[PDB]
Ligand binder design. Sequence first.
Ligand SMILES: C[C@H]1O[C@H](O[C@H]2[C@H](O)[C@@H](O)[C@@H](O[C@H]3[C@H](O)[C@@H](O)[C@@H](O[C@H]4[C@H](O)[C@@H](O)[C@@H](O)O[C@@H]4CO)O[C@@H]3CO)O[C@@H]2CO)[C@H](O)[C@H](O)[C@@H]1N[C@H]1CC(CO)[C@H](O)[C@@H](O)[C@@H]1O
Length: 388
Amino acid sequence: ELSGTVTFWDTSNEAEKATYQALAEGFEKEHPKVDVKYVNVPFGEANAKFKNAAGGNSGAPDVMRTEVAWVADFASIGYLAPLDGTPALDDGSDHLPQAAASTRYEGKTYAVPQVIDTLALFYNKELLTKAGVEVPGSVAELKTAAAEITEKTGATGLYLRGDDPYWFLPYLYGEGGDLVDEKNKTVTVDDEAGVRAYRVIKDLVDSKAAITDASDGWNNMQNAFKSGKVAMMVNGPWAIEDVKAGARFKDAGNLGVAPVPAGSAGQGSPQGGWNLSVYAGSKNLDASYAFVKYMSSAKVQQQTTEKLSLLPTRTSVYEVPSVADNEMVKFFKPAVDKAVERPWIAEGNALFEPIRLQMANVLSGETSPDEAAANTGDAYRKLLKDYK
Ligand SMILES: C[C@H]1O[C@H](O[C@H]2[C@H](O)[C@@H](O)[C@@H](O[C@H]3[C@H](O)[C@@H](O)[C@@H](O[C@H]4[C@H](O)[C@@H](O)[C@@H](O)O[C@@H]4CO)O[C@@H]3CO)O[C@@H]2CO)[C@H](O)[C@H](O)[C@@H]1N[C@H]1CC(CO)[C@H](O)[C@@H](O)[C@@H]1O
């Protein structure tokens, strides 16, 4: 017996949201006495919007699309219903383990996995071919390629997103670095790899291998890539359908994807994604648990992939020929398998702001790579009282 309102806050983007609204409302097919109230909440506003509503117990959603780092955020302050022993969890073991870790806080389950993702190098196949260059495997190989692209086509090699701190991580990993050593509770972002990573990004822009912008970075990146102003960008699966809307990439075939470039030490890309959580103060808990089970079901994950090319969290879904034979998926799944995990801690979400500020100042020339790394480390030690 399910009935009543289930308000769902979805953070998915302009290209994704019609699909997600349809899936959400599809819950009513099997439960016609439930009224699904779909609301799209912009990614940048959603964390604060949810905390505001939950903290005041006023107009909070029943079900929240919850970024991997937000689960511990929200859970630690009491805003999420624990899900262990509820109908929200069905065939839990099916989910990728690294997806499952992000749902956990202090020995309890506060979310169900929805999608998993990572960053990759997207490229314009026809531009690279016209430039006579191969997809670059390293930063060194990207610089050489960018020069040939400018010389032969007039395009810039890379749009380097300059306003979102997540985009720093591939460069950090490529220089042999990482934010923290979790096992040893030690801040590591200010090791020499951090200095090198800030220096690499500045060199890419100064050398004109890359362009960037200090604001409106998502739109600027997409516009530059779709208009052929650049040959390459670093982005994730949430960009695929948006890109394919463009005249340049209808022929889905013209859209190349490859790993993010190696740096001087190695190569890596971060693990991200989205889970589904239930507000602790929901006045329709049964219907919400069922809604979460439905939205995380193999059937719905498969449909999401078919319409959007977003990656399922369920292992079984990869065995469905329709998913197993998808080319964006065929690339992204192995890349996700290799993606770097982060500490799933209450202050994990706040590790990004320090990077954002220092990265902006490095790109504008206000701050040296050396100072930026030290500043980032200083901010982490302030955030993480039991880290050295
Ligand atoms: C600073 C923020 O730090 C963190 O976020 C990390 C995040 O943990 C990383 O994993 C990564 O997330 C990936 C994501 O995994 C990936 O899927 C994709 O998301 C797509 C969707 O796919 C697409 O469907 C649609 O939704 O659109 C999504 C976006 O395209 O890309 C994400 C990266 O963009 O990177 C984030 C850092 O960016 C915090 O969580 C904060 O919320 C914080 N926000 C601040 C906002 C404030 C402003 O006043 C205010 O000052 C600050 O205090 C606020 O806190």
